[PDB]
């Protein structure tokens, strides 16, 4: 066959455009399965008979789970070397970042306005925000990786206290995704949410959700450690049965065209130097990105997940 088998943690609407362009431009057929969980364990249990070629991630911690479990292989590509800056790929060539995203704080336009300079994630645990914060499941990987970064910066005790305070301030039982929290802001249920940056652009582009975005302000935390960054990523599976095609896919996704699609269609930040963000994303302005090393986020993921369970974050 002339195919590549993709296991995707990315949502269809945020990856199918790139994959369809890849199919058209290369002639390689994409077979894709989607999930929110269980794909790493699936590759592991499938073992040497796994058909997986490419694992698409939305989180550095998932990437490292795959790589640490010896489920990846090293890819030595001059195309990836050129297209992906070194800070967004494994020094040992087993994973590759394709975009970055910020986990931001959305606020009610009407009831909060823009956050002041210096506002940090930690501030969301302060008693003045009781009943005013919406967050999706604390066990969602975007949240766990944020909390993992917080462990690196503040330690486990202060991060646990933060999670207790954040939980205490929730306006409702964690439910829905990042966009749904912004709907809740629009409807007046909460005044603050945590969510990824690109969703704001997706909502603005959606006729049914632009009113949600219009009721909210995107804020990039500007405390000591700035705004949390994470990546969409990719690994080629250890036993990739269509490895040449897999390499062609990840090389394609790293290229000028696909990076432009990530920027323009997804409102993510491309990794490739020289590729501009969308007009919407540019309009948000710049911000201070956390300088934490991507691997040091992942290092703390399991501890962060344990904290989320300990504080029973999702139990209202
Ligand atoms: Fe996402």
**CA of 11 relative to ligand 1 center, distance in Å:** 7
Give me the architecture of the 1-98+227-275 domain, per CATH: 3-Layer(aba) Sandwich (3.40)
Segments of the chain assigned E as strands = 3-8, 29-34, 54-57, 96-108, 133-134, 192-196, 216-219, 228-236, 269-270
**How many Cα neighbours within 13 Å face the side chain of 25?**
15
Does 200 appear as a known binding residue?
no
Exp. method: X-ray
The structure was resolved to a resolution in Å of 1.4
> How far apart are the C-alpha atoms of 149 and 299, rounded to whole Å?
9
Two tokens, residue 178: 């990042």
Residue 19 has which token pair? 């994959």
Q: How far is the CA of 154 from the centre of ligand 1 (A)?
A: 26
How far, in Å, from the CA of 266 to the mean position of ligand 1? Answer: 10
Q: In CATH, what is the architecture of 99-226+276-316?
A: 3-Layer(aba) Sandwich (3.40)
CA of 16 to the centre of ligand 1 (A): 13
Burial class (CB in 10 A: 0-12, 13-18, 19+), 77: middle
d(CA 1, ligand 1 centre) in Å? 31
Determine if residue 199 is labeled as part of a ligand binding site: yes
Domain layout of the chain by residue ranges: 1-98+227-275, 99-226+276-316
CA distance 47 to 38: 14
- Check for a shared fold between 1-98+227-275 and 99-226+276-316: yes
DSSP letter, residue 275: P
Judge whether 269 is annotated as a binding position. no
d(CA 49, CA 31): 16
Tokens found for residue 305: 């997940």
Give the contacts of 254 (CB within 8 A, at least 6 positions apart): 79, 80, 83, 84, 96, 98, 271, 272
């Amino acid at each position: 066959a002339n195919e590549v088998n993709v296991y995707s943690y990315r949502q269809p609407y945020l990856i199918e455009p790139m994959l369809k362009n890849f199919e058209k431009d290369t002639g390689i057929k994409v077979n894709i399965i989607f999930a929110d969980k269980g794909l790493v364990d699936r590759v592991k249990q499938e073992g040497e008979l796994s058909p997986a070629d490419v694992l698409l991630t939305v989180d550095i911690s998932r990437v490292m789970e795959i790589v640490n479990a010896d489920l990846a292989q090293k890819i030595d590509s001059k195309v990836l070397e050129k297209n992906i800056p070194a800070q967004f790929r494994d020094s040992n060539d087993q994973w590759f970042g394709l975009t970055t995203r910020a986990r931001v704080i959305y606020t009610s336009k009407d009831r909060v306005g823009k956050l002041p300079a210096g506002f940090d994630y930690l501030d969301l645990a302060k008693p003045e925000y009781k009943g005013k914060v919406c967050v999706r499941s604390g066990k969602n990987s975007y949240n766990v990786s944020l909390f993992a970064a917080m462990i690196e910066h503040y330690g486990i005790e202060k991060t646990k206290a933060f999670l207790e305070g954040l939980k205490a301030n929730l306006a409702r039982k964690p439910q829905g995704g990042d966009r749904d929290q912004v709907k809740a802001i629009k409807e007046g249920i909460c005044d603050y949410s945590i969510g990824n940056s690109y969703y704001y652009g997706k909502m603005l582009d959606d006729e049914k959700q632009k009113s949600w975005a219009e009721a909210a302000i995107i804020n990039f935390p500007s405390g000591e450690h700035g705004t949390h960054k994470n990546i969409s990523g990719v690994v080629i599976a250890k036993h990739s049965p269509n490895k040449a095609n897999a390499v062609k896919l990840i090389e394609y996704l790293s290229g000028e065209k696909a990076q432009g699609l990530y920027a323009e269609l997804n409102h993510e930040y491309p990794v490739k130097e020289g590729i501009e963000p969308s007009a919407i994303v540019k309009g948000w302005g710049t911000f201070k990105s956390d300088t934490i090393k991507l691997e040091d986020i992942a290092k703390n993921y399991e501890a962060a997940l344990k904290l989320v369970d300990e504080v029973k974050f999702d139990d209202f």
